[PDB]
């Protein structure tokens, strides 16, 4: 009944450019189902919508760590709040206000039909109820199996349906023994039922600014992206420069990488972690540029306790980690790996 219908309404909204400022783009433009709900073509990189429905609502846990939420800086509590933010966000749909959204919904007879069947007669004449309903529908759609199918090779191997290759097995073993599992595993110990390779925490791993993206954003050379501290209501200076730990599902097909898209290749993202561990001169150099990585955009609150592990990944281990992370690709996106 209403479960299916609510998601189906969200599926219609998700592909409708009428939800954008000048009817130019839909949520699908930037979060394209053909590219794991990222952009196949603002200063932050567009993250995947796949598995986003597994993230808990934003909260502060009992040890004082913040966890959960949506956006790179956690400023939406959950997917319904995110959708409302997205509809009015200048770097997403950019509608000027909630009434403009309701007016677009009212223009379309199928939306009068679909929204009234689910939320009651006259819903679209009330801009607050209209907007809230649209965000509710968009969130329900993203919570469907299609966005989180758990059908990767990794999934199949964990179900005992097939085996890792030797190289994929080595990479899994490195991932679970090296520092990656401190942040890109859901739990501290035990076995997750629906692992998405993120503990949903906020960390500053000390990335440099992406110059060319920063220039194209029009934010200004004097802009600094403070991550979680930019969430309204967070004032704790220890959160400055921290970003949500991304799920690594589909990582092999969603480049470029990190909050600002600074590295184009998955191998580079992995090599970045050697800057904290390796003594070799090459560990200081971004291979995509031949220059030093660059100083951290925010030179405080770095997760040095996890990052300064004492162990360098040799090239064999980096090859193994690439192979393992490619097994986290949903079945439908396997063709993209060639």
């Amino acid at each position: 009944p209403a479960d299916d219908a609510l998601a189906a309404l969200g599926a219609q909204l998700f592909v409708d450019p009428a939800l954008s400022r000048n009817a130019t783009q839909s949520c699908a433009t930037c979060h394209d189902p053909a590219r794991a709900f990222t952009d196949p073509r603002g200063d932050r990189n567009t993250p995947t919508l796949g598995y986003a429905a597994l993230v808990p609502a934003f909260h502060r846990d009992a040890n004082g760590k913040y966890k959960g939420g949506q956006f790179w800086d956690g400023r939406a509590d959950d997917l319904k709040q995110q959708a409302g933010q997205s509809m009015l966000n200048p770097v997403e749909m950019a509608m000027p206000d909630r009434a403009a959204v309701a007016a677009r919904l009212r223009d379309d007879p199928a939306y009068r039909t679909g929204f009234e069947a689910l939320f009651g007669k006259g819903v679209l004449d009330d801009p607050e109820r209209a907007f809230d309903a649209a965000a509710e529908a968009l969130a329900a759609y993203q919570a469907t199996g299609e966005f989180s199918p758990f059908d990767s090779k990794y999934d199949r191997v964990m179900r005992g349906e097939e085996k890792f290759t030797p190289l994929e097995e080595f990479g899994y073993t490195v991932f679970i023994t090296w520092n990656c599992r401190l942040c890109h595993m859901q739990r501290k110990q035990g076995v997750a039922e629906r692992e998405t390779f993120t503990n949903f925490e906020y960390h500053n791993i000390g990335l440099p600014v992406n110059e060319t993206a920063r220039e194209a954003s029009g934010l200004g050379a004097d802009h600094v992206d403070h991550g979680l501290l930019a969430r309204p209501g967070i004032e704790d200076p220890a959160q400055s420069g921290r970003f949500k730990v991304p799920s690594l599902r589909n990582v092999a097909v969603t480049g470029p990488y990190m909050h600002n898209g600074v590295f184009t290749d998955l191998r580079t993202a992995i090599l970045f972690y050697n800057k904290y561990t390796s003594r070799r001169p090459e560990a200081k150099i971004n291979p995509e540029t031949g220059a030093p990585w660059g100083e951290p955009e925010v030179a405080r609150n770095l997760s040095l306790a996890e990052l300064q592990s004492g162990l360098m990944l040799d090239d064999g281990r980096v090859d193994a980690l690439v192979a393992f992370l490619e097994t986290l690709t949903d079945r439908r996106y396997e063709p993209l790996l060639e």
């Binding site: 030797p166 023994t177 520092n179 501290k188 110990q189 592990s309 004492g310």
Partner: protein, 131 residues
């Protein structure tokens, strides 16, 4: 008691060397010096490095990855010593090797061995070692 016999796991006493999660432990069980099965005793430093074994749990018949961690910065505890080596490989396959003092990442650069914890981190097995 026959040291050369195939090791037989149990799931009824974590302080004994035949407890199933200790299949590749080398050192001393932390629960015997004021830690617990998966936590370090006071005053010690929890390493971030780890070694892994796929250990069969006879209770549920599942094989779990135990990613051992050392608690570092104190002299060896001397309580509950154990060495098991299920699927343990030589040093040149270090992710499976247990003579190494896996204290890397411990706070304060602590590198001396005090005891080892046995937390589960996955349900999986290895090509070189499966039930």
């Amino acid at each position: 008691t026959d040291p050369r016999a195939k090791w037989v796991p149990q799931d009824n006493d974590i302080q004994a060397c035949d407890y199933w999660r200790h299949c590749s432990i080398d050192g001393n069980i932390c629960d015997c010096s004021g830690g617990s099965l998966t936590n370090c005793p006071p005053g010690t430093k929890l390493a971030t490095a780890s070694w892994v074994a796929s250990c069969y749990n006879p209770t549920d018949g599942q094989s779990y990855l135990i990613a051992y961690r050392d608690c570092c910065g104190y002299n060896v505890s001397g309580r509950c010593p154990c060495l098991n080596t299920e699927g343990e490989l030589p040093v040149y396959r270090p992710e499976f090797a247990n003579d190494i003092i896996w204290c890397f990442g411990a706070e304060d650069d602590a590198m001396t061995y005090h005891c080892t914890i046995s937390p589960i981190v996955g349900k999986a097995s290895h090509h070189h070692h499966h039930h």
